[PDB]
């Protein structure tokens, strides 16, 4: 359910979601175009650390201003 703007892509709401899981994770490389960091839509706050900056928030409007790219 629309937890932030959009997970991988643009079109719809994360098919898997509960908490606005602001996941700034790179795994090792970060192979997608150039993620705009944290969005979420997953479950719990099980780690939130290491090389994974996670701003897991269970608020209603976790998505402050509809800006994606910008200029």
């Amino acid at each position: 359910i629309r937890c932030f703007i959009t997970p991988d892509i643009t079109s719809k709401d994360c098919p898997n979601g509960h908490v606005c899981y602001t996941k700034t994770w790179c795994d090792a490389f970060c192979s997608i175009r150039g993620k705009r960091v944290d969005l979420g839509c997953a479950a719990t706050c099980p780690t939130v650390k290491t090389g994974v900056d996670i701003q897991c928030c269970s608020t209603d409007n976790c998505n402050p201003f509809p800006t994606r790219k910008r200029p």
């Binding site: 991988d8 643009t10 079109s11 175009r33 994606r68």
Partner: peptide
């Protein structure tokens, strides 16, 4: 020409799942 993109990701226009 033609080959536009299947590139957007982060919103602007349609999808990047193709």
């Amino acid at each position: 020409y033609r080959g536009w993109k299947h590139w957007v990701y982060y919103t602007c226009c349609p999808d990047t799942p193709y």
